[PDB]
């Protein structure tokens, strides 16, 4: 819960970017995969219905991403806009397609709805975890076209 006499307009202000890690990577030393790199892969994915990114709508957040480079595991928790949003599966699917194209095949990606943030979270998580149904969905030309529109970088 949050107070009514106290409201913090600063959240509008809180969105920022910092992509300066080059010095550490300048040498020949390997650079582990981290939360920041995955977040940079999904923060600018466009919402299917609105002219804003998943980051601007707080659908994806850096601290909702868990990753272990050595154990080849990536977990993404995304909060769809409103609990009865019928686009939750589409949004998570665009996240999957982006990570599927951008991540090494050794990485096992899990994309789930943030717990308690959607009425049908169990059913959506089950669809996104079924690799056969995800593949069959990508063979839908209209669906793949909308996904490509969300994944496009501009």
């Amino acid at each position: 819960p949050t107070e009514i006499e106290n409201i913090n307009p600063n959240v509008y202000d809180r969105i920022k970017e910092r992509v300066l890690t080059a010095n550490e990577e300048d040498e020949n030393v390997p650079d582990p995969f981290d939360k920041r790199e995955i977040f940079d892969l999904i923060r600018n994915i466009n919402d299917p219905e609105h002219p804003l990114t998943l980051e601007e709508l707080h659908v994806v957040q850096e601290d909702l991403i868990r990753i272990n480079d050595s154990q080849n595991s990536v977990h993404i928790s995304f909060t769809p806009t409103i609990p009865h949003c019928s686009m939750a599966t589409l949004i998570g699917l665009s996240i999957r397609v982006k990570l599927l194209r951008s991540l090494p095949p050794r990485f096992k990606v899990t994309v789930e709805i943030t717990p308690g943030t959607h009425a049908s979270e169990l059913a959506v998580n089950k669809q996104l975890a079924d690799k056969e149904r995800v593949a069959a969905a990508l063979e839908n030309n209209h669906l793949a076209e909308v996904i490509n529109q969300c994944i496009a970088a501009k």
Binding site: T21, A22, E25, N28, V29, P30, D31, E37, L41, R101, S102, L103, P104, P105, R106, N141, A144, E145, N148, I151, A152, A153
Partner: protein
Amino acid sequence: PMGALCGLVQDFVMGQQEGPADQVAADVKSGTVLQVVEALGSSLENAEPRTRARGAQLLSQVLLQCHSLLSEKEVVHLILFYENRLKDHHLVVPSVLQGLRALSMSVALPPGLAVSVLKAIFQEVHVQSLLQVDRHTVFSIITNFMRSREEELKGLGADFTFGFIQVMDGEKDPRNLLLAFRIVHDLISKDYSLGPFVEELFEVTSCYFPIDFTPPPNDPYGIQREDLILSLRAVLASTPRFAEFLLPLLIEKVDSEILSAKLDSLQTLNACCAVYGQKELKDFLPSLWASIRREVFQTASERVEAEGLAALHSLTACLSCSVLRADAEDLLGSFLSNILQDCRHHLCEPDMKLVWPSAKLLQAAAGASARACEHLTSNVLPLLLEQFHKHSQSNQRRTILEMILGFLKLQQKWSYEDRDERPLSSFKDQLCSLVFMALTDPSTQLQLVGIRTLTVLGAQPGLLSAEDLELAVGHLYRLTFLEEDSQSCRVAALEASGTLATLYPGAFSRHLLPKLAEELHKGESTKCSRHFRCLQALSAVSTHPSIVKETLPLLLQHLCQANKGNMVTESSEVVAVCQSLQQVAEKCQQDPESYWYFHKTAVPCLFALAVQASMPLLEDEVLAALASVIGTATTHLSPELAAQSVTCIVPLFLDGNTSFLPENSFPFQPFQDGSSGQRRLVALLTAFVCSLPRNVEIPQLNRLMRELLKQSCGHSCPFSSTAATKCFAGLLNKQPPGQQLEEFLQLAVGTVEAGLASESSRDQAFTLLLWVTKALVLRYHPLSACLTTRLMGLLSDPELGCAAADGFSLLMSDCTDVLTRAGHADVRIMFRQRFFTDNVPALVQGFHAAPQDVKPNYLKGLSHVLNRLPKPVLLPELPTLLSLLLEALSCPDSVVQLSTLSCLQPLLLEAPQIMSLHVDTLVTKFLNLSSSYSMAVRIAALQCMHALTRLPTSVLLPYKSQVIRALAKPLDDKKRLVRKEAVSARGEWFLLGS
């Protein structure tokens, strides 16, 4: 013959018109007019209207070709006949008016006849009922008489303009509309007598106004919209006789919600203000500004905004000129205050969205006349100052100041008198407090705006309090010292430091130079960024000659205090001192005395160097930056001062004379001894002698170059020998084509080939060859033809082959130290084209006819050329050359790999049809290189794999499958950036097909 003439008639009437049209004209050209009009009279006397109309049209077609060559006794008769036939005939009139147009183009007619010619046509024929083409003929008859006989048409009085008023009442065609506008404009331009018809004349023109259109059947033929809108501006703005009529129309138009209209009305208003004045707009002057202000707030079109602000400008300008005209009373300066009072409450309003456009308006009216702004600023400033102190928020204070800033600039723009300074003095001390407030605020933006105002108040001719200068300088030092801020605030303060320094140099010698002198020895006895601040601070203030006379000894003293203590070890910080000196010399080249003083301390600079050789400290490379500093001193030099310093420097190297330099160095032969120290010092000569004006007038060029050649290769030093070649070539390039230059070349090719003969020092001879061929290449001197094709042979030599590649690479790039466009070294821009053309046959032929072992040396050279010429010329030779550029990627050298990749990347996006023919070998080479040891190489290779997507889908599709599989490996690359590039590349490769 009359039989032939009668026949031509009948043939025309029967429909064989074209032959007779020209054949009757031919009979006219040779033969008579009266015979043909009598033959045609019979055919025209026939009862059928088409039998009259056809005859008349073939009469006019004749009269049009005959033109001038017509008797006065014929012109009268013809015009009379035409009048009678037009009076009697219906739908025959078009043929008649074409003949009247023909008759209006002759000049041998009586005065009364000419006047009646048109008077009768507009009293008889109704223009609106007539066809578009025929209306064009009627209008052109007018314009004809409006050219041939003005005195008659003017003598007709105002009833001519009235008659024309009715002919042009209703006319929709654009083609004639421009004609009608011309007639109106000429009725105004020439002093044609307009009677009570001023109203009537404006009435017809006024109605048409904004609508713009294009015609579907004839689009380019149909003269476009802006053509018509401009012709109307011309007529509606030609007279102030239209004022009491046009201004109410334009206001009517501006207040209408159609945007195209809103525009044309202000564009016209601006054109009117060029020929209006005080009285014509006086009655409607209050209403007009309400409309201008209106649209400056409301409108979203910035071109509307701009034109309306231009309107308020030209308006107040028109009112400021008439303050001198009206000797009795001025009702013009009252309008300015009527604006002020109407937006005072709007500015005072705490809302910041409303405040900016009204300030834009006040600035537009102020920047119209010095008289206007001296009223406006003096009235506006106290309100802006009051509102500055009322608002405690930062962004508000920044905007308020940015608004004040404009007014201040405008004050400096026109007024130069002591009059505008008098009310400004009342606000002077109040303004400074705002400037210093903007500098103290933690805002970066507010600071920058304060700096912007500081320079503007500094620019001011009007006197300012001395204390403020003391304060301001202190503030500037605080802003140049603090680094917790973003770099921008620092640079802004440094630039302003120089700007104000040229105005008031005492202020910076009083409150900045001592502070920095103290800070110098406070770090002399984390450390580098502290040094940067003050060194650059002394560099940036070095704008006034007095300051230069102070900052130079301080920097040289810091340089001669660096060798005594522990500062020589840090070669980086010594380089920084030189960098600042080079920047001061760079500033001194403006004022002649300034660079004269700097050059007389270029001497102690070389002294501090000679001493370094006399002892047995500075790092070998630090010297090069010192030499670049010396070079910046030498250029821009008085020819007499140049001779003076040459006769001090050249003596020192050549004979060891150190007379000019101070005694401490005396405790010396660089040329014939063999001592390493003195040989190192040659590179300062490279900077000097080779950075002199074209008219060098050197005293002993022959001996110096003679010594240089032996020094260049005989010593065989790692870098000292090269400095000699660098210098020799630097001076050789600059040398004019005198009978000496060829001797210098004889000695150059001599020592070169001689060193190439001896086993012991091939590289020394090679470097000299390189620099000599370069100097002659940038000159396009014929001997470079041989020497470059000498370096062509050396590509096959095992010892020097890699050195031959290095040489080609050097020839391909401009270098800072030797020969520069601003270093007074002669160069022509087109050398890459000239060099490339010669190179391709030699290198391509050499590559194919080269043995397996020393075959890739030729490609290394070709690449160092091709990639360094990213030019148009690379495209037309690409079909032959790309085959090699692809095999250039397979070279093991990382520099070659990088250069060839960097060059190939845009080619894919500029000329893809030529590239798409080599896709298989393109993708194979790129994917091979996206897995090399070098990080940068992999990044480039991936960017080219990402660029390959730009080619047509058709050629890419058979590769998508294999490509994606391969691109999986770089996704798991050790470095972060190579993963970023793989992300982009693969992502694009996935969207290839749908």
